């Protein structure tokens, strides 16, 4: 990912003059994944604009190879004493990280939260990100259920056990499917955000459920794997697949018909607006406490537009 989408705000006020000429921001996010590359695009755009105004923003971009709730706490505690003006967090475990945030705030360092979900019950100054993973799950599930004519069998790739946004999307899937009583959810399995596991899960489902009619995929990786397995079995377009996020393989699968709908989030503004609001916070200025970046459903007719803008 090198650009943004049409979701990004075109009317965001950046006229405020920062009360310093230099700022240092430590970013710590749940785990390495291509998804975060789309946020980093917004960060790098804000730093450029602020460099033209004689303002130098330096930042570190840290995430572990695999998610580790304690590592995230440790990353916050250790950054406190390293001379950062603000700590930006994409959250692993809200309760554990909340307390780590409060410790950083108590010791004089403001904290921003960004990305997939907010920690509203902690002393973070502001949030920029998706305020509604449940709704994203509902959007995908409604689209797939309606495309299936409100009847048939759906299987659910459910991602990583206990991951907040995965679990909220999954709750949205099920609450929505419940509104179509002629649809049966035959199974749900945890791919753990691994493409190969999503492939193997889907392969098993194609054997076990000859009548499978739809698959819902709650993270950026599992639509890739569902589409690959469905295409390899010759079932592209005959099983209705809906998934999260913007992997180029998923967006290309929209064009070829294997994927029906992708739910793309405004990752760019998560990073772009994080920087500008961080500065207002470091300076003591007020800023919107919760900025919702938004998301939208992308079908085949919008695939090329999103591919071109993101890649």
Numbering used by the authors: 58 to 368
From the paper:
Clostridium thermocellum has extensive potential in lignocellulose biorefineries as an environmentally prominent, thermophilic, cellulolytic bacterium. Previously, five putative sugar transporters, denoted A to D and L and belonging to the ABC transport systems group, were identified in the genome of C. thermocellum, and the solute-binding lipoproteins (SBP) of these ABC transporters were shown to bind different dextrins by isothermal titration calorimetry (ITC) assays. To gain insight into the structural mechanism of the transporter specificities, 11 crystal structures, both alone and in complex with appropriate saccharides, were solved for all 5 putative sugar-binding proteins, thus providing detailed specific interactions between the proteins and the corresponding saccharides. Combined genetic, biophysical, and structural studies have provided solid evidence that transporter A and transporter B are the major glucose and cellodextrin transporters, respectively, among the five potential sugar transporters in C. thermocellum.
The unliganded CbpC and CbpD structures were determined to 2.00 and 1.50 Å resolution, respectively. A Dali search using the CbpD structure revealed similarity with several monosaccharide-binding proteins in the closed conformation. A nearly closed substrate-binding pocket between domains I and II was found in the unliganded CbpD crystal structure, which is suitable for accommodating a monosaccharide. The small substrate-binding pocket suggests that CbpD cannot bind to cellodextrin, in agreement with our titration and genetic experimental results. CbpD has been proposed to be the transporter of xylose, but we could not detect any xylose-binding ability in either ITC or NMR experiments. For CbpC and CbpD, no interaction was detected for all of the tested carbohydrate substrates in both ITC and NMR experiments, suggesting that transporters C and D are not responsible for glucose or cellodextrin transport.
